[PDB]
Amino acid sequence: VNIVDYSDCFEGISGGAIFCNTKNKEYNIYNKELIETRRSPCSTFKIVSTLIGLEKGVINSKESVMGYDGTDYPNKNWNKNLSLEEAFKESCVWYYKKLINKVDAKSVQNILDDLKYGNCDISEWEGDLKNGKGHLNGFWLESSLQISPKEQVQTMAKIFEGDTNFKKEHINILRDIMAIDVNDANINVYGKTGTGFDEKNKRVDAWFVGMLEREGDTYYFAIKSDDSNKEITGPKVKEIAINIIKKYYS
């Protein structure tokens, strides 16, 4: 366990980072207190919900569709019968809500328990209804389910090192759709952003979680901001993570 200083890359935004190489158990941590604090995963839960849907047969391939019903949405790309790969890349809420609502709660509870997915609390299944967004809500979006950045990294490692019961075929679909292009052919980066606002603490939950492969070494990582500035989003935190990877992990 190495405590490190990545503040240069955070460019004044409050947050922390953890990178872990499980082959030589090296654990690089910036802002340990934040890295150990559980927060709503927000859209980073799509990593796990994709695997749940694949395992239960609700979806089967990166082509699979959820039967778009014509409902009007402000994001252009949500207004079509999009595939798993597009719904993941566009963070299409209706697709992933329809997906998860086809799965019984006990199956979800047992998968989260097996993964040690934070507090594994799905009690508020329908999410944070007081925000007025109705069916665009769920237990994983600023609601009952909470996970720390360290736990995210531990979950990512278990999945992608092949230590869960999920099918290898399904792991590879998720690998495929999380691949990121960082304009550096010598590292393979995979990840997913998440964005939420913690109304109780008046701080953002801005995430970028994933993994990095560079010549034999694999690093599992989670970068997290808790800034009070509402302009700090998951996409912004992904920028920060990419700066860290290029400066320290190239």
Ligand SMILES: *C(=O)N1C[C@H](NOS(=O)(=O)O)CC[C@H]1C(N)=O
């Ligand atoms: C997930 O966190 N969400 C879905 C969507 N995409 O977020 S992301 O750009 O950080 O991946 C919008 C924000 C958020 C939500 N409001 O549900």
